[PDB]
């Protein structure tokens, strides 16, 4: 059924040029126009435009003529969208769609900087002693100083749901990101679970894995 | 160029109320307008199509109202998984304007912080930094506030708090606050305090350790 897989994130450049693209499985791509969206941080999204593949219809919403140009390939599937003298300004999430009403994809996220990619450093969170304060203890990971967004963080290889929290990343004085993913387990259960915190920074291929 | 706009912006409202959003648009879509509930770093999901048609997997306490101009989504008895943006998109006559954005927190009542304060992590101090990490872990509203004591020095300035989206299922927040000092700042004092102040708490309480 309906799939739509986008590139993951890509940190460019300033004025220079990225190309996302969407890949879409389980239908027949040449009947639907793909459209496209950018959302910036805690914000509304605007549309771009729309590339039907097959009649090679394509319309932009007019402030994104220029700096966006839609274009697809009829045989993998594939619209792409390629934004054009990168800026800060550029810097947001951009999805694609389905139809008018359909299925969006996942999202891909633009940093657009200057600075350089820094996989992250994962520090452990244990507390000092038991007993601080219910029979609830908490253990996590500091993914500190890395750039670009976005870091994945996830417990005991995907097995541990119940309890965690992953905060959202922050900025840091150095403009490099920080987060930290805490557990809340009760005291009882010291020794019951080992807890391994995975880290995934997908921009620098940094793939960790802490035990607490 | 047709603008929608989206009233209101912010809903606070209990679990079981009755929630209406609308949204207008500048001139008239002939209900081609489609509802989408996005929640915290995801992909929007279908509501409702054609102004007034539910989408394949939405639940019956969703409903689309409107016509001309004037378009709504109503959830009736609301529940602890309706928080998230909600956003509407009119697809008559290109561009294809988005709304403002409606953000839902469901209410609850008082829950108050369970602390939490953790050392920093040698590795890390053999890194020439040390950051100490306070956890106020599942309370509601969200506004609580954290003060640092690093001896018994107020230290205001060098910390920084992120927080949770509310969770789906009991509707609390969680917060860290990472208080940052050199490796030197942080081995020239004993006691790291996070002290936490929420309406909820009776009388505030505050965590420490030592070195």
């Known amino acids: 059924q309906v799939q739509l897989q986008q590139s993951d994130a890509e940190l460019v450049k300033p004025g220079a040029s990225v190309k996302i693209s969407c890949k879409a499985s389980?239908?027949?791509?040449?009947?639907?126009?793909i459209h496209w969206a950018k959302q910036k941080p805690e914000q509304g999204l605007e549309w771009i435009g729309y590339?039907?593949?097959?009649?090679?219809?394509?319309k932009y919403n007019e402030k994104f003529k220029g700096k966006a140009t839609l274009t697809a390939d009829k045989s993998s599937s594939t619209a792409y969208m390629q934004l054009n003298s990168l800026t800060s300004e550029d810097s947001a999430v951009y999805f694609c769609?389905?139809?008018?009403?359909?299925?969006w994809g996942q999202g891909t996220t633009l940093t657009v900087s200057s600075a350089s990619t820094k996989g992250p450093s994962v520090f452990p969170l244990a507390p000092c002693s038991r007993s601080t304060s219910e029979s609830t203890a908490a253990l996590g990971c500091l993914v500190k100083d890395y750039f670009p967004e976005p870091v994945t963080v996830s417990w005991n290889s995907g097995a541990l749901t119940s309890g965690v929290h992953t905060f959202p990343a922050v900025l840091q004085s150095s403009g490099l990101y920080s987060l930290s993913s805490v557990v809340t387990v009760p005291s009882s259960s010291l020794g019951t679970k080992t807890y391994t915190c995975n880290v995934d920074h997908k921009p620098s291929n940094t793939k960790v894995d802490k035990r607490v | 160029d047709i603008q929608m706009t989206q009233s209101p912006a912010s809903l606070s409202v209990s679990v079981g109320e009755t929630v209406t959003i609308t949204c207008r648009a500048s001139?008239?879509?002939?209900?081609?307008l489609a509802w989408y509930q996005q929640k915290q770093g995801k992909s929007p999901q279908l509501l409702v199509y054609?102004?007034?048609n539910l989408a394949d997997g939405v639940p019956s306490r969703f409903s689309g109202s409107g016509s001309g101009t004037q378009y709504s989504l109503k959830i009736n008895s609301l529940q602890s998984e309706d928080f998230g943006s909600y956003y509407c998109?009119?697809?008559?006559?290109?561009?294809?304007?988005f709304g403002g954005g409606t953000r839902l927190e469901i209410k609850r009542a008082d829950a108050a912080p369970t602390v939490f304060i953790f050392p920093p992590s040698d590795e890390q101090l053999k890194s020439g930094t040390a950051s100490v990490v306070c956890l106020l872990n599942n309370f509601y509203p969200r506004e609580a506030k954290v003060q640092w004591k690093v001896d018994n020095a107020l230290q205001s300035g060098n910390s920084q708090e992120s927080v949770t989206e509310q969770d789906s299922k009991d509707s609390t927040y969680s917060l860290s606050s990472t208080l940052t000092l050199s490796k030197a700042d942080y081995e020239k004092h004993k006691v790291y305090a996070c002290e936490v102040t929420h309406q909820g708490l009776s009388s505030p309480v505050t965590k420490s350790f030592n070195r």
């Open positions: 769609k389905r139809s008018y009403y359909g299925h």
């Open positions: 389980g239908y027949t791509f040449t009947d639907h126009a």
């Open positions: 590339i039907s593949p097959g009649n090679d219809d394509i």
């Open positions: 001139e008239n879509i002939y209900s081609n």
């Open positions: 054609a102004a007034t």
């Open positions: 998109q009119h697809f008559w006559g290109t561009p294809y304007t």
